[PDB]
Tab-separated table of C-alpha atoms and ligand atoms in Angstrom:
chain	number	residue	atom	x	y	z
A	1	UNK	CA	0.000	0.000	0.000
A	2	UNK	CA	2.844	2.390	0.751
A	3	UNK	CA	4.822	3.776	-1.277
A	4	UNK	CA	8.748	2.412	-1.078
A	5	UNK	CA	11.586	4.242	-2.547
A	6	UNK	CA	14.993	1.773	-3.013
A	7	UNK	CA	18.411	2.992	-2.306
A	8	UNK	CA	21.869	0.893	-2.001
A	9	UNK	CA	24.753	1.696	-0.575
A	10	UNK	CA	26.708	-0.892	-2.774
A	11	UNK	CA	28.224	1.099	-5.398
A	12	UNK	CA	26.575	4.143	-4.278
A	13	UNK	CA	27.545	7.584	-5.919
A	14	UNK	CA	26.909	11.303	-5.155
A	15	UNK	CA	24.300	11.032	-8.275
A	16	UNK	CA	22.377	7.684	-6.898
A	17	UNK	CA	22.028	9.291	-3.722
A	18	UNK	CA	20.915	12.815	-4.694
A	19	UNK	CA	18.235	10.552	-6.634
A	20	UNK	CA	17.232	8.997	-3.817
A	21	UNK	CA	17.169	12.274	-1.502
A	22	UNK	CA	14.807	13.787	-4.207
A	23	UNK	CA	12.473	10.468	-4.341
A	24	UNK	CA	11.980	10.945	-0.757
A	25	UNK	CA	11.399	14.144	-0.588
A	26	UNK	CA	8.457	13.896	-3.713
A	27	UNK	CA	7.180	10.863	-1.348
A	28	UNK	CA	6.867	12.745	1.894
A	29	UNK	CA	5.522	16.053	0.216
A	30	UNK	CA	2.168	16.576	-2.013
A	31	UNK	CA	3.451	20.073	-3.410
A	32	UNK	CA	0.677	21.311	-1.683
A	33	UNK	CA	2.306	23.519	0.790
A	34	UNK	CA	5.341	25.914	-0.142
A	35	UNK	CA	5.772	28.829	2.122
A	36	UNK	CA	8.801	31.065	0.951
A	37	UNK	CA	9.602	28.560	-1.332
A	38	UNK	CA	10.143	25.976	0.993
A	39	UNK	CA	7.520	22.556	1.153
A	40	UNK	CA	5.420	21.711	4.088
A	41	UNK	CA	4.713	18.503	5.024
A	42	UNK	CA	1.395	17.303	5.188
A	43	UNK	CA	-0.823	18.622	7.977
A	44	UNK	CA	-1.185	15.108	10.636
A	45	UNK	CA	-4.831	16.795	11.439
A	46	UNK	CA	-7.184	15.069	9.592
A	47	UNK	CA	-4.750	13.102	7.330
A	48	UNK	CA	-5.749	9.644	6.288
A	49	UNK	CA	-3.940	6.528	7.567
A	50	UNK	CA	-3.680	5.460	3.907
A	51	UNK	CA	-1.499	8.260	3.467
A	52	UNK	CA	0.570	8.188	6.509
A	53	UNK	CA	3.945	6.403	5.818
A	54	UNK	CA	6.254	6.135	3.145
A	55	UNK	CA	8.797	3.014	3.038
A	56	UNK	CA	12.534	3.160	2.685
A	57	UNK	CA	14.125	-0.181	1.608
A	58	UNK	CA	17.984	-0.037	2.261
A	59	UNK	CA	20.099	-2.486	0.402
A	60	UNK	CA	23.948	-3.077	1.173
A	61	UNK	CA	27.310	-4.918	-0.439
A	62	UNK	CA	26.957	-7.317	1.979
A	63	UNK	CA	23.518	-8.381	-0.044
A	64	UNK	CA	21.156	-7.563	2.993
A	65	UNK	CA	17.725	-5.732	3.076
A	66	UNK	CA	15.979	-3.500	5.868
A	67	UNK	CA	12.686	-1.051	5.203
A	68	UNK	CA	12.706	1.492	7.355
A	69	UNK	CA	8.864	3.193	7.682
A	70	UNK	CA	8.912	6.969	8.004
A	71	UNK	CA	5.760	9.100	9.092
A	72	UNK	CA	5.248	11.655	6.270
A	73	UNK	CA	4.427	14.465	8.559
A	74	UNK	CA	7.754	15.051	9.902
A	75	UNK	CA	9.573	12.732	7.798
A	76	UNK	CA	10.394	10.544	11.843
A	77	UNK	CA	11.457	6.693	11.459
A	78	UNK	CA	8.854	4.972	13.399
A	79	UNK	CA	10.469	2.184	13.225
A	80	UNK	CA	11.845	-1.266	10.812
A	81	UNK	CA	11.600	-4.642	8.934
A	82	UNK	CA	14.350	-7.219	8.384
A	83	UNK	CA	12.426	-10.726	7.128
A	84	UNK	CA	10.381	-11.830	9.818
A	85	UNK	CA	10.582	-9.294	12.147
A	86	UNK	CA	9.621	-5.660	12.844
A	87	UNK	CA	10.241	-2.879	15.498
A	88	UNK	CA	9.344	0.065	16.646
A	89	UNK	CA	10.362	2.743	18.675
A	90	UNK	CA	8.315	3.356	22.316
A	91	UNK	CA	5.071	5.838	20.330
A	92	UNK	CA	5.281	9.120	21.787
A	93	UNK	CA	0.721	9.145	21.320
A	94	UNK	CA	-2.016	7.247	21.079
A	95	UNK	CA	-2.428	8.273	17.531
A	96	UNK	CA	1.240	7.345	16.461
A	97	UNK	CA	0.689	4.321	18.244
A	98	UNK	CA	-2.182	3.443	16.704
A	99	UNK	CA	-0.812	4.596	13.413
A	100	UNK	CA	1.894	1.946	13.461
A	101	UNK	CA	-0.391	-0.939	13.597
A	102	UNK	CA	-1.119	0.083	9.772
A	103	UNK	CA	2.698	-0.760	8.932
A	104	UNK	CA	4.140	-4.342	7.739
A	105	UNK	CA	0.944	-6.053	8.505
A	106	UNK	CA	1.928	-9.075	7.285
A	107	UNK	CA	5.731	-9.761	8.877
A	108	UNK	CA	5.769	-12.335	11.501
A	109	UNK	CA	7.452	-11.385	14.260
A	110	UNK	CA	6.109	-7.462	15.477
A	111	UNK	CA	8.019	-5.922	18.551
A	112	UNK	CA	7.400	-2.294	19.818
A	113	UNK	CA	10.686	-0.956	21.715
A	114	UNK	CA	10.345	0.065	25.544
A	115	UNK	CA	12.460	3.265	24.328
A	116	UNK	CA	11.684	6.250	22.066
A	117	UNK	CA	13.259	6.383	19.157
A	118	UNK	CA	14.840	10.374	19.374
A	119	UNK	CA	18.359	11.288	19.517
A	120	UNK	CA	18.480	11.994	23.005
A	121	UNK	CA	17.179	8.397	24.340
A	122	UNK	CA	19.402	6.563	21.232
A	123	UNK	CA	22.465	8.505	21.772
A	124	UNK	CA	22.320	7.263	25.867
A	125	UNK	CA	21.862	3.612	24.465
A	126	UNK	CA	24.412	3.930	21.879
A	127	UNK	CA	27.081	5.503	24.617
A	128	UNK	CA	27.943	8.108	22.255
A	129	UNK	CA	26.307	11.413	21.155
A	130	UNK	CA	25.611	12.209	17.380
A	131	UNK	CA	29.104	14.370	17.179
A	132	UNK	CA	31.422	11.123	17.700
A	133	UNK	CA	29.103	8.674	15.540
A	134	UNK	CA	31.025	8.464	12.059
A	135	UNK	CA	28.497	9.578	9.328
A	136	UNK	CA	29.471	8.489	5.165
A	137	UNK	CA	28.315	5.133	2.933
A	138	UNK	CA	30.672	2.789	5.059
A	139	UNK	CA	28.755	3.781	8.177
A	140	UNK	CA	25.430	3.245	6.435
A	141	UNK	CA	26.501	0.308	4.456
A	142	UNK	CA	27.723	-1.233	8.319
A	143	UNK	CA	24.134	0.232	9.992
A	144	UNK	CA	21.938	-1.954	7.402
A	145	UNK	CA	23.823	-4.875	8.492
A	146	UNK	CA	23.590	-4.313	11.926
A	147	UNK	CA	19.483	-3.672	11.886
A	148	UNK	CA	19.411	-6.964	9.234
A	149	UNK	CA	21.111	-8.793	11.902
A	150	UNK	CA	19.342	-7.584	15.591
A	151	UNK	CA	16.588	-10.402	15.643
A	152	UNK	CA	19.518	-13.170	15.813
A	153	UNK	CA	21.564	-11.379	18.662
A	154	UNK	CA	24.267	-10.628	16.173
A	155	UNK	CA	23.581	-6.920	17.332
A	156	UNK	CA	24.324	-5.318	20.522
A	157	UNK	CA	22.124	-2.459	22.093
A	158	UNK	CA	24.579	0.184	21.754
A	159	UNK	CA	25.382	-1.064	18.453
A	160	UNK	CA	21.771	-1.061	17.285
A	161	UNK	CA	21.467	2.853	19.096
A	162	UNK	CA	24.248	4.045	16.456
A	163	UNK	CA	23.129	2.179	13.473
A	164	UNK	CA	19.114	4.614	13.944
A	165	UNK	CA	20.998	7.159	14.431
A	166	UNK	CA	23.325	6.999	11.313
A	167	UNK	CA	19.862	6.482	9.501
A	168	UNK	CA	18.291	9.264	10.760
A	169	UNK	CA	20.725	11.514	10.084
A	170	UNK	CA	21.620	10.214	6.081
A	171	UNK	CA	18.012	9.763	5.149
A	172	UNK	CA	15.388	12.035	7.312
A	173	UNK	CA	17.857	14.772	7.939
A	174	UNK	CA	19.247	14.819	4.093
A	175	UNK	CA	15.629	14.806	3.150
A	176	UNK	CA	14.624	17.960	5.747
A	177	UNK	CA	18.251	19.869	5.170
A	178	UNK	CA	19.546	20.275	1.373
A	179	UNK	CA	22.496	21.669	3.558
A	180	UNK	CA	23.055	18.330	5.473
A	181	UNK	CA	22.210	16.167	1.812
A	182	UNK	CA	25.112	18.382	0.782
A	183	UNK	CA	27.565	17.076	3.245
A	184	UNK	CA	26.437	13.498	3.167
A	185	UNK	CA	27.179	13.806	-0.644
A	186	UNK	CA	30.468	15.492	0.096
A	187	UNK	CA	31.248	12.202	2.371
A	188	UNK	CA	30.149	9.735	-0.287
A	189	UNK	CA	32.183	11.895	-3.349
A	190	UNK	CA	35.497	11.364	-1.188
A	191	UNK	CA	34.233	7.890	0.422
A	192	UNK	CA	35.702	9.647	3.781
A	193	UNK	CA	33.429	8.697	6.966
A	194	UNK	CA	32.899	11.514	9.829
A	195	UNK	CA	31.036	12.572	12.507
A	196	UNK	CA	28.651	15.698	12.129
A	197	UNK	CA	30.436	19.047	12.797
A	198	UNK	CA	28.055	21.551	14.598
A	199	UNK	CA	26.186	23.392	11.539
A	200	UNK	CA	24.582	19.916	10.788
A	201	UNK	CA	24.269	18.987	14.393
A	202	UNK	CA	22.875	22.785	15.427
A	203	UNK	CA	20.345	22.225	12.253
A	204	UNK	CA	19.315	18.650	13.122
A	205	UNK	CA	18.372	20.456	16.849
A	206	UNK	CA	16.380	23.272	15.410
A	207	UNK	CA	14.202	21.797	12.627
A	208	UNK	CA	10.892	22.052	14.831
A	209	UNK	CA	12.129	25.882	15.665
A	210	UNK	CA	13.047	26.890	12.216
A	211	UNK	CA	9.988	25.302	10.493
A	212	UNK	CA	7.510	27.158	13.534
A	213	UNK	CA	9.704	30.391	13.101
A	214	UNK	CA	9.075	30.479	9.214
A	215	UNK	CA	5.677	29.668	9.661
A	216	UNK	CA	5.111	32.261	12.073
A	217	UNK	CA	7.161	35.406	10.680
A	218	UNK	CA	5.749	38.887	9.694
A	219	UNK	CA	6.418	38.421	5.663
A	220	UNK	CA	9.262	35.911	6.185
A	221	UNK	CA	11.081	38.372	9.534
A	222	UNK	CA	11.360	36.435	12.291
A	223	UNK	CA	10.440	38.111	15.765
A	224	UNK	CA	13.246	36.298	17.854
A	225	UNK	CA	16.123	35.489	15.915
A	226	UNK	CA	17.454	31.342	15.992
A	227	UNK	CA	20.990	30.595	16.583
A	228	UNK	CA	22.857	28.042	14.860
A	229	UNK	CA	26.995	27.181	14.488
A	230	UNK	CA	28.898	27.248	11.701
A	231	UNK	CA	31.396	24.336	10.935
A	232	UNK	CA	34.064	25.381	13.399
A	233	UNK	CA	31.479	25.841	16.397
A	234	UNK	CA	30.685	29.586	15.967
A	235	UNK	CA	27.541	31.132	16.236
A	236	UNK	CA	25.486	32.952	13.883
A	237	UNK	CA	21.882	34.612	14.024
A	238	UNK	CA	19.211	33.897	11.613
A	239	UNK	CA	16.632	36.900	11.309
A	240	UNK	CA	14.681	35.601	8.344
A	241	UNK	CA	13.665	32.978	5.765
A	242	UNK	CA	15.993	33.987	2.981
A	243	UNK	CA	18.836	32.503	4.532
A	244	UNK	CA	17.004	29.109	5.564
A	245	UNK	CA	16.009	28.806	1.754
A	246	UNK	CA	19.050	26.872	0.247
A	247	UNK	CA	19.320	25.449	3.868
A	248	UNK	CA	16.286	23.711	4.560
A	249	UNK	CA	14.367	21.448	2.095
A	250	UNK	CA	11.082	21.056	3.923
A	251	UNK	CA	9.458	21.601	6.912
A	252	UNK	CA	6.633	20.155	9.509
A	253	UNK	CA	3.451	21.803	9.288
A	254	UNK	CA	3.462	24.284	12.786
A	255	UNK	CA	0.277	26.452	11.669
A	256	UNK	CA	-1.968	27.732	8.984
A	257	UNK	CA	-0.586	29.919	6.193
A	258	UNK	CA	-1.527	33.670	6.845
A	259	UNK	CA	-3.697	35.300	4.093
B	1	IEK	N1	13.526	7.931	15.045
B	1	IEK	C1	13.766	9.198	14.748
B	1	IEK	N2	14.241	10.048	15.681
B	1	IEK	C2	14.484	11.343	15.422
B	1	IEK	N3	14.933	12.149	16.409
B	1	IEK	C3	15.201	13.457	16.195
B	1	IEK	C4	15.635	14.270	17.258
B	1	IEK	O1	15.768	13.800	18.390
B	1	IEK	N4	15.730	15.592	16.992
B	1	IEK	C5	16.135	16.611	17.986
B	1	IEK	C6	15.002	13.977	14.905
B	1	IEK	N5	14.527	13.140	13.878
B	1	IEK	C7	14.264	11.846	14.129
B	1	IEK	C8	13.775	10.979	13.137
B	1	IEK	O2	13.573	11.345	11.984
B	1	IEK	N6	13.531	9.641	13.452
B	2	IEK	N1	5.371	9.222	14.216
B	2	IEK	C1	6.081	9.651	15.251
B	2	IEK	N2	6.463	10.942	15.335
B	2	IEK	C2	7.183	11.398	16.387
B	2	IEK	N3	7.545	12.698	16.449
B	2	IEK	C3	8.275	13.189	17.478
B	2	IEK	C4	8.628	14.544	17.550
B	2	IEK	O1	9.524	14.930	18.305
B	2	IEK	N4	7.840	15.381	16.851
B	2	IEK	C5	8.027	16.851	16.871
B	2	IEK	C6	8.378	17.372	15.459
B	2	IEK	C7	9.765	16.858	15.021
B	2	IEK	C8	10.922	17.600	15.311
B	2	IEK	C9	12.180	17.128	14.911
B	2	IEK	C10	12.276	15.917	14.212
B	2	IEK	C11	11.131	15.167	13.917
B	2	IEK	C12	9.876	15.645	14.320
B	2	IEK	C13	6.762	17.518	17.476
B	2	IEK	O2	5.915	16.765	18.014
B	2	IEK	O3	6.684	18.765	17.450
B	2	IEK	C14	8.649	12.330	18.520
B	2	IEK	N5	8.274	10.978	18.461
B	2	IEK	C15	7.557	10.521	17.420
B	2	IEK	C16	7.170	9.181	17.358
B	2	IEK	O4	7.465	8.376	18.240
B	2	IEK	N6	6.427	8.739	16.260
């Protein structure tokens, strides 16, 4: 029923992945919604279960399969499939729990996680934070492995922690940020694996803010301005949209659009 978009990490190029970062992003968005020329994401109020998820299948060198199921209004992985089993993280609602009852219907094995699935919670199971967890294709390419193999107790916990949060970060945060699609491209052009320097991980932390401080402006001027870090740690102020343009590729829906 839902739609799946296919990426591999064998053989994987800047092009293959921009492709894939752009079949996401036409997934999660209806072209509905542009405010200062940057997408919405559907409104969750009133939207039909039948529309709720998209499906990411991530294939690997090592000839292994996951599909990771991503809620289309803020583009969050709820959770996985590898064969005969499926998890998910802890639901944060009743409705997201109930929503997630709707996905891989037919896979044996169905487990709901006692934790949440945000960074905070999987960077305290993983024993690192994002900013020492090695993002680039070998780190991907490793993290479909490790979800393929969790149901067998090839995985550790910690292990487990770090392979979500290297998803996260390559597909939902590449498809939110064309600034952070820019520097996983720039990791898979050079094949050189690193952790996120603080622009992405300052960008990653203010999505929600950003997307309600567009949404809310006076023509685009923000009333408090949002501070972020450049790549060697140092702040900078953002006072309006036109900045966040070739920054941010789409945003969660905060409120309506003013006349
Ligand atoms: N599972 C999952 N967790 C996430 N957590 C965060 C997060 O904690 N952001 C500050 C952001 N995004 C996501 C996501 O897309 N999926
Ligand atoms: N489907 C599903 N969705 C979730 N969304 C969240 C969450 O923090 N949502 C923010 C918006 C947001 C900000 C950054 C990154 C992603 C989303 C919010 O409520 O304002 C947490 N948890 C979940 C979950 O467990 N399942």
């Amino acid at each position: 029923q839902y739609p799946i978009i296919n990426f591999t990490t064998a053989g994987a190029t800047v092009q293959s992945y921009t492709n894939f970062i752009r079949a996401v992003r036409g997934r999660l968005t209806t072209g509905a919604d542009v405010r200062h020329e940057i997408p919405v994401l559907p409104n969750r109020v009133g939207l039909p279960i039948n529309q709720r998820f998209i499906l990411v299948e991530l294939s690997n060198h090592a000839e292994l399969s996951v599909t990771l199921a991503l809620d289309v209004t803020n583009a969050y992985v709820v959770g996985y499939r590898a064969g005969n089993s499926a998890y998910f993280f802890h639901p944060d609602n009743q409705e997201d729990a109930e929503a997630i009852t709707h996905l891989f219907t037919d896979v044996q094995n169905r487990y709901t996680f006692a934790f949440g699935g945000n960074y905070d919670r999987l960077e305290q199971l993983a024993g690192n934070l994002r900013e020492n967890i090695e993002l680039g294709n070998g780190p991907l390419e490793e993290a479909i492995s490790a979800l393929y193999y969790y149901s067998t107790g090839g995985t550790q916990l910690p292990t487990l922690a770090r392979s979500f949060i290297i998803c996260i970060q390559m597909i939902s945060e590449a498809a939110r940020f064309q600034y952070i699609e820019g520097e996983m491209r720039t990791r898979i052009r050079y094949n050189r694996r690193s952790a996120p320097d603080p622009s992405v991980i300052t960008l990653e932390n203010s999505w929600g803010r950003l997307s309600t401080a567009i949404q809310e402006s006076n023509q685009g001027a923000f009333a408090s301005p949002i501070q972020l870090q450049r790549r060697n740690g140092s702040k900078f102020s953002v006072y309006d949209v036109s900045i966040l343009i070739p920054i941010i590729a789409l945003m969660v829906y905060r409120c309506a659009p003013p006349p």
